[PDB]
């Protein structure tokens, strides 16, 4: 709006939980990954109900108790589900910052010919200048 780098940024009763536990996309129930409990609770005793926030990338369900979160954030950068690659993994040191994705005339390229001691420092598009190389799962298992 004013020149920002836009990458991922945009007290009532139990009624929060039905508005979050039902997405009305397929008429099903979303179950968290750490625990296989939706924990919608009962209307008479709503204290056992747990708020669930979904991911903004892969729509992975997550309880507010499994991941150390205490509130829903809807202004600013969208919440990231912690089941993805780290953005600034630190190992003098190294600050990995990815190589992004290229949509300009398919410049990113796909050349799978080695997949051995590839040493491609990550950045793989897994299948069953800048070069996002192609990798397979057999090579990942082998190495």
């Amino acid at each position: 709006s004013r020149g920002q780098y836009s990458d991922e940024n945009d007290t009532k009763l139990d009624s929060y939980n039905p508005d979050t536990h039902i997405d009305s996309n397929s008429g099903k129930f979303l179950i968290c990954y750490k625990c296989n409990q939706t924990r919608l609770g009962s209307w008479s005793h709503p204290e056992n109900s747990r708020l669930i926030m979904t991911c903004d990338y892969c729509q992975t369900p997550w309880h507010l108790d499994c991941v150390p979160r205490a509130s829903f954030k809807n202004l600013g950068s969208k919440w990231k589900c912690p089941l993805h690659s780290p953005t600034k993994v630190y190992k003098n040191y190294k600050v990995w910052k990815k190589q992004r994705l290229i949509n300009k005339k398919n410049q990113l390229y796909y050349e799978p010919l080695q997949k051995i001691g590839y040493q491609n420092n990550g950045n793989i598009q897994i299948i069953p200048d800048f070069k996002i190389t192609q990798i397979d799962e057999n090579s990942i298992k082998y190495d």
Partner: peptide
């Protein structure tokens, strides 16, 4: 348990394996 494994990097594996 590794038993076998067989741009300009498309041919260095063959010479390394043979020699």
């Amino acid at each position: 348990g590794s038993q076998s494994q067989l741009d300009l990097q498309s041919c260095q594996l063959l010479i390394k394996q043979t020699e």
